[PDB]
C-alpha cells in the first residue's frame, strides 16, 4: 500500500533489507527487515553538532550505491579468513540551513554497519558532536538480553564503569536499567519468533568516544548515548571532537531468523582496517596465572618461580605476574625471574595499572602507563628484559580522553614489541584488526568473581551460555576460565565452591575465545585433577581458523565447533536444570572416530571414543552444569 521509503538497500542474498526515510519526515529514520519480517521498526538517525543540527527535517539530496567484494585475513578472532560481500548505500543529507551530512550503510547477508560522514564546510575544519539521535526501535513483542551500565566512580577504589555487570535473559523491553544509565554494548534482542538482533559498534579509536545504549523510551526505542560526565573522575569532556572531513564510528546490527549469524558475525572487523603495521611476529598461546587462585599472597619471587615451573611442565608459553609485583618483588629481581623463565622456555606478561589520576588504585605498579615519557621509559626496560606482554588495568571510562590513552598505550607497546591485554576496561571495538599487538580485553564479569563470590559460581553456567552469543561474539574476551580446582582457594579446601563439572570447564576453553589465555589452573592440579583433564589442557589451542554454530539458546545451553588447521573441536554445555538431549548433525566428523570427553553418570570426567556414521548423526545427553567435548 502506501510506502514512504526514500530508498532501499539489500544484502547480497536479499533476505536482509534496510529502508531509509528522510524526505518529508520530521525525524530522519531507517527500518530493517529480514525475510519479510520487521526486525527493526522506524529508528531515528542524525546528530546534534556545534557546526549545525542534523536532527530534524533533513533532505535527501542524492544517493549512490556500490558493491563490496574483498578478502581479508585476521588473526585473534573466531575465524582466520573472511570473504566480505556487501552492498553499500551512500546517502547525502542536508538540513534547512543547507549544511551537509553523509550516511553510509554497508549491508552483508546478516549485518548492517552504518556511519555518518561530515565534510569540510562553513569554513570549519573541526567539529564537536554534542549528541547522537541515532536509535534502534524494536517490534512490540521484543525481549532483551542486556547488562546495565553502572554509576560512575563506584565499585573497587572508584574504578567503575568497568563493563562488569550482570545480564537478564528474555527481559521485557519496559524494564528499567539497574542504575538508570542504560546498557553497554553489545546488546541482544529476541524479535518474538522472527529471530534475533545484536546491536553494537566498531571502529572506535582516539577520534571518538565509546558509546552505549540509553534506557528505553517510547516503549521500544534505544538511543545511542555518550559517556557520563562523572566518568574519569570528572576529567575530560563528554562530547567527541574531530577533524573535518571526518566520521562517526560504525553502528552495527547483526540480524537473522536464527542464532547462527549472531554467533558467526564478523562485522566488528568487516568495516575497519589496521591503523599501523607491525615489525613483530607476536606469538600467542597459554599462560599460568598465580593470582586468580592464590591471590595477593602469591605475588612473591618463590611462588612466581612455582608458576613459571608449572608453565614449563604444562608446556605453556607464558606466565602472568599480577598486581603488587613492583613493590613486593621489584624491578631488579624481575630480571632474574625473566632469565629463570627463559631457561625453562617460558616468557612473561607483567601487570600494570593504567591509572595515574582518576581513581584510588594503590596496587602497583601505578603511574607507569599514563605519561608517555614514563611509559616509553618503562617499555624500553621491558623490551631490554625481553618481557613479551603487559596486562593493563583500571581505566577511566568511555570518554575520548580514555580512548586516547588506550590507543597510545597500544602504539608505544608495539614500538617495543609488546602484546597488550586490557582489564578493568571497556568493550573492544574491532580492536584486533585495528591494532596488530592487541591480544584481548576483560570487559566482562571474569572468573575472578567466582573466586570472590559464591553467587557467580552458581551463575557460571548461565553466563557461559550467554557469552558466545553476546560479549565474546564481537571480540576477544580474557575470561581466565577453566577452574579445575573444586574449592577456589590456594589449598583447594576452602573459599567458594565450583558448581560445574571438569568437562564443563574443558569445554569452556573452546567456548570462550581469546588469543592469549591465562587459564585458572594451579600446580596442585597436576596431582588432584584426573589426568585426562590436564592432558587435554596440555593440547588446548587459543587461536582458530573457523567457528561454526551448531545449536543453543542464550543462557540455557550452547553448542559450537571451532577448527584449528585440520582439527575440529566441538564443545557444548548445559545451564538448564533438566538433562539436555541433543540430536546433532555434525558434518565435521563425517564417518570418523572422535575423541569424546563426557561427564560420567557420577559427574566425573571420562575420555572415550565415538564413531560418527556417514550421516553425521550424533546423539548426546548433557547433565545440568555439565558439558561435552568432541575432538578430531
Which CB, 208 or 422, lies closer to Ca ion?
A: 422
Cross-strand pairs, 618: 584
Tell the smallest beta-carbon distance from residue 499 to Ca ion (Å). 21
Tell the smallest beta-carbon distance from residue 489 to Ca ion (Å). 19
Tell the smallest beta-carbon distance from residue 156 to Ca ion (Å). 8
Which CB, 424 or 495, lies closer to Ca ion?
A: 424
> In b/e form, how buried is each residue of 426-435, taking b as 16+ CB within 10 angstroms?
bbbbbbbbbb
Q: What does the alpha-carbon distance between residue 293 and residue 495 come to, in Å, rounded to a whole number?
A: 10
Q: Which of residues 367-426 bind Ca ion (CB under 5 A)?
A: 424
Q: What is the Cβ-side half-sphere exposure of residue 223, based on CA atoms within 13 angstroms?
A: 17
Q: Is 54 helix (H, G, I), strand (E, B) or coil?
A: strand
Place of cell 536444570: 577
Q: What does the alpha-carbon distance between residue 128 and residue 139 come to, in Å, rounded to a whole number?
A: 33
E strand or H helix at 373: helix 372-385
Tell the smallest beta-carbon distance from residue 372 to Ca ion (Å). 25
Which CB, 424 or 436, lies closer to Ca ion?
A: 424
Please answer whether residues 199 and 185 qualify as being in contact, where contact means their C-beta atoms are separated by less than 8 angstroms.
Answer: yes
Q: Which of residues 304-333 bind Ca ion (CB under 5 A)?
A: none
Number of residues that bind Ca ion (CB under 5 A): 1
Q: What does the alpha-carbon distance between residue 145 and residue 554 come to, in Å, rounded to a whole number?
A: 8
Looking at beta carbons, which residue is closest to Ca ion?
424
Which CB, 205 or 322, lies closer to Ca ion?
A: 322
E strand or H helix at 115: strand 111-118
94: alpha, beta or left, given left = phi > 0 and alpha = psi -120 to 50? beta
Give all strands (DSSP E) within 226-291, no chain letters.
Answer: 241-243, 246-247, 250-256, 285-289
Closest CA to 9 of 27, 40, 30, 35: 30
Which CB, 150 or 254, lies closer to Ca ion?
A: 150
Tell the smallest beta-carbon distance from residue 425 to Ca ion (Å). 8
Which CB, 195 or 424, lies closer to Ca ion?
A: 424
- The runs of H, that is alpha helices, within 448-530 are 448-452, 454-458, 460-464, 502-511, 525-528
Place of cell 607507569: 368
Which CB, 424 or 552, lies closer to Ca ion?
A: 424
Tell the smallest beta-carbon distance from residue 448 to Ca ion (Å). 6
Q: Which three cell numbers stand for residue 408?
A: 597510545
Tell the smallest beta-carbon distance from residue 472 to Ca ion (Å). 16
Which CB, 371 or 453, lies closer to Ca ion?
A: 453
Tell the smallest beta-carbon distance from residue 589 to Ca ion (Å). 38
Tell the smallest beta-carbon distance from residue 603 to Ca ion (Å). 30
Which CB, 301 or 452, lies closer to Ca ion?
A: 452
* Interacting residue ranges for Ca ion, rule: CB under 5 A: 424
Amino acid at each position: 500500500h502506501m510506502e514512504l521509503q526514500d530508498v532501499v538497500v539489500k544484502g547480497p542474498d536479499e533476505k536482509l533489507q534496510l529502508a531509509v526515510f528522510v524526505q518529508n519526515e520530521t525525524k530522519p529514520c531507517y527500518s530493517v527487515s529480514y525475510n519479510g519480517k520487521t526486525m527493526l521498526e522506524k529508528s531515528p538517525l542524525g546528530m546534534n553538532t556545534n557546526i549545525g543540527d542534523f536532527t530534524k527535517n533533513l533532505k535527501l539530496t542524492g544517493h549512490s550505491v556500490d558493491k563490496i567484494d574483498t578478502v581479508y585475513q585476521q588473526t585473534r578472532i573466531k575465524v582466520s579468513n573472511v570473504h566480505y560481500r556487501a552492498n553499500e548505500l551512500t546517502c547525502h543529507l542536508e538540513n534547512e540551513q543547507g549544511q551537509k551530512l553523509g550516511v553510509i550503510f554497508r549491508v552483508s547477508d546478516n549485518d548492517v554497519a552504518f556511519r555518518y560522514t561530515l565534510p569540510h564546510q562553513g569554513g570549519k575544519a573541526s567539529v564537536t558532536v554534542k549528541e547522537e539521535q541515532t536509535g534502534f526501535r524494536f517490534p512490540e513483542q521484543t525481549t532483551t538480553f542486556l547488562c546495565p551500565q553502572s554509576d560512575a566512580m563506584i565499585g573497587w577504589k572508584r574504578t567503575k564503569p568497568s563493563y562488569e555487570e550482570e545480564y537478564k535473559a528474555d527481559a521485557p523491553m519496559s524494564d528499567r536499567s539497574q542504575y538508570g544509565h542504560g546498557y553497554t554494548f553489545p546488546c541482544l534482542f529476541r524479535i518474538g519468533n522472527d529471530g534475533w538482533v545484536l546491536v553494537s559498534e566498531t571502529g572506535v579509536d582516539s577520534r571518538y568516544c565509546g558509546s552505549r545504549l540509553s534506557d528505553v523510551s517510547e516503549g521500544n526505542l534505544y538511543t545511542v548515548a555518550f559517556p557520563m560526565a562523572e566518568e574519569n573522575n570528572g576529567n575530560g569532556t563528554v562530547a567527541p571532537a574531530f577533524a573535518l572531513p571526518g566520521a562517526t564510528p560504525w553502528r552495527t546490527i547483526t540480524v537473522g531468523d536464527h542464532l547462527k549469524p549472531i554467533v558467526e558475525t564478523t562485522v566488528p572487523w568487516d568495516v575497519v582496517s589496521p591503523l599501523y603495521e607491525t615489525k613483530h611476529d607476536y606469538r600467542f598461546g597459554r599462560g599460568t596465572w598465580s593470582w586468580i587462585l592464590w591471590q595477593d599472597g602469591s605475588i612473591n619471587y618463590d611462588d612466581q618461580v612455582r608458576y613459571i615451573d608449572f608453565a614449563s611442565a604444562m608446556g605453556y608459553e607464558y606466565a602472568l605476574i599480577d598486581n603488587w609485583w613492583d613493590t613486593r618483588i621489584g624491578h631488579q629481581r624481575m630480571k632474574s625471574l625473566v632469565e629463570y623463565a627463559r631457561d625453562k622456555g617460558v616468557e612473561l606478561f607483567l601487570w600494570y595499572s593504567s591509572s595515574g589520576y582518576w581513581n584510588d588504585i594503590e596496587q602497583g605498579p601505578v603511574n607507569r602507563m599514563d605519561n608517555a615519557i614514563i611509559r616509553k621509559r618503562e617499555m624500553k626496560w621491558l623490551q631490554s628484559l625481553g618481557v613479551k606482554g603487559i596486562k593493563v588495568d583500571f581505566f577511566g571510562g568511555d570518554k575520548q580522553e580514555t580512548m586516547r590513552l588506550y590507543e597510545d598505550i597500544l602504539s608505544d607497546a608495539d614500538d617495543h614489541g609488546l602484546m597488550v591485554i586490557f582489564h578493568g576496561c571497556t568493550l573492544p571495538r574491532g580492536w584486533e584488526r585495528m591494532y596488530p599487538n592487541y591480544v584481548g580485553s576483560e570487559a566482562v564479569l571474569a572468573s575472578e568473581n567466582m573466586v570472590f563470590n559464591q553467587h557467580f559460581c552458581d551463575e557460571e553456567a548461565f553466563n557461559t551460555c550467554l557469552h558466545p552469543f553476546i560479549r565474546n561474539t564481537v571480540g576477544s574476551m580474557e575470561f581466565g576460565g577453566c577452574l579445575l580446582n573444586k574449592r577456589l582457594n590456594r589449598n583447594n579446601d576452602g573459599g567458594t565452591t565450583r558448581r560445574t563439572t571438569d568437562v564443563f570447564q574443558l569445554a569452556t576453553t573452546v567456548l570462550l575465545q581469546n588469543p592469549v589465555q591465562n587459564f585458572a589452573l594451579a600446580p596442585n592440579n597436576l596431582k588432584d585433577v584426573p589426568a585426562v583433564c590436564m592432558d587435554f589442557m596440555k593440547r588446548v589451542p587459543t587461536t582458530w581458523d573457523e567457528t561454526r554454530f551448531v545449536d543453543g539458546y542464550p543462557g540455557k545451553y550452547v553448542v559450537l565447533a571451532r577448527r584449528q588447521g585440520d582439527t575440529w573441536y566441538l564443545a557444548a554445555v548445559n545451564a538448564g536444570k533438566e538433562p539436555l538431549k541433543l540430536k546433532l548433525d555434525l558434518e565435521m566428523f563425517a564417518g570418523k572416530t572422535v575423541a569424546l570427553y563426557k561427564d560420567d553418570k557420577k559427574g566425573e570426567p571420562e575420555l572415550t571414543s565415538l564413531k560418527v556414521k556417514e550421516n553425521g548423526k550424533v546423539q548426546l545427553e548433557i547433565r545440568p552444569q555439565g558439558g561435552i567435548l568432541c575432538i578430531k
